[PDB]
């Protein structure tokens, strides 16, 4: 497909649960409310 927070279209696009945050990796680009505890 294509991405909306980059225009790269490569370095892999997440479209799981209707979000993109893997053309800007979510570890760097957090505050989506996710956490790791386990």
């Amino acid at each position: 497909r294509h991405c909306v927070i980059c225009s790269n279209q490569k370095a892999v696009i997440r479209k799981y649960e209707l979000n993109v945050c893997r053309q800007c990796f979510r570890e760097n680009a957090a505050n989506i409310g996710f956490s790791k505890l386990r």
């Binding site: 649960e17 979510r26 956490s35 386990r38």
Partner: protein
């Protein structure tokens, strides 16, 4: 018919301030209150590669959300429901329903 209130939120201790506290106002005060126990809590689980390159040990993560759906039931308020749903303002993603 009978009006129900589902409150859906990411976080506990937002919904708590809604159900327990602000249902006291509707408890026998203007309508009758039938408490069940709230609906099953979904997880949204996502799996993200830590490494930004092909050299690591090919590591991954487990990220999880809680989805709290807090259901309590009433017996047919009409026009009174305006009060009920104006009570919480205390957090974002507090949404309420009327049948």
């Amino acid at each position: 018919q009978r009006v129900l209130v589902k409150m859906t939120s990411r976080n506990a201790k937002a919904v708590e301030n809604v159900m327990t506290e602000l249902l006291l106002h509707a408890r026998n005060e203007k309508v009758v209150l039938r408490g069940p126990v709230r609906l099953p809590t979904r997880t949204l689980k996502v799996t993200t590669r830590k490494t930004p390159c092909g050299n690591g040990t090919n590591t991954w993560d487990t990220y999880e959300l809680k989805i709290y759906k807090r259901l309590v039931e009433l017996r047919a308020p009409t026009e009174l429901v305006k009060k009920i749903t104006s009570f919480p303002i205390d957090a974002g993603v507090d949404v309420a329903i009327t049948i």
